[PDB]
Amino acid sequence: MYSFMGGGLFCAWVGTILLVVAMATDHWMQYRLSGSFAHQGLWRYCLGNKCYLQTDSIAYWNATRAFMILSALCAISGIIMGIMAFAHQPTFSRISRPFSAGIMFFSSTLFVVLALAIYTGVTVSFLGRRFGDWRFSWSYILGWVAVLMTFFAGIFYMCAYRVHEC
After folding, report:
1. Which residues of 107-128 are buried (b: 16+ CB within 10 A; e: fewer)?
2. One GO molecular function term?
3. How far is Cα 86 from Cα 21, in angstroms, rounded to an integer?
4. What is the C-alpha to C-alpha distance for residues 40 and 52, in angstroms, rounded to an integer?
5. Side-chain-facing half-sphere of 109: CA atoms under 13 Å
6. What domains does the chain contain, in order, with CATH numbers?
């Protein structure tokens, strides 16, 4: 019955973390020079003897940063709706209670497949022959893992939509 309610919420409860463990993890691209092996994230940079922050704010950087928050805000606004999916609260008939999360999670799934594509679509074009250690590191992966986690979080919630009303 309500296994989708208890299943789809779990696919988002972990996916919401991977999005947060993607904006505060300075490992979007691995690179090193002379005695400072580290990584490079959206906001903060890192080296060895010290750290580093942004300097110019590039177009594809200021695109991914906003779209990932637009996904997390569209992801936390689903687990709180998943809490509201169990408890029936009389409100109205438009937009079902165990169904609105399907549009909300898929919306969060939409602004991450675009946020991760704007990164890759410009990174290899803006670089390549210059930066030698071109590598999408272990935070770029967690963004793509959360792409599938919150995707199923909408699938399970959308699957229960037909089971309930029909």
Report:
1. bbbbbbebbbebbeebbeeeee
2. structural constituent of eye lens
3. 28
4. 9
5. 19
6. 3-26+57-165 (1.20.140.150)
Listed resolution, Å: 3.5
- What DSSP assignment string belongs to 106-140? HHHHHHHHTHHHHHHHHHHHH-SSS-SS--B-HHH
d(CA 119, CA 123): 6
Identify the burial level of 56 via C-beta atoms within 10 angstroms of its C-beta, where 0-12 means exposed, 13-18 middle and 19 or more buried: exposed
Placement of tokens 């691995």 in the chain: 30
The 8-class DSSP code of residue 22 comes to T
Distance CA 26, CA 121 (A): 20
Distances (CA, A) of 116 to 7, 37, 64, 66: 26, 24, 7, 12
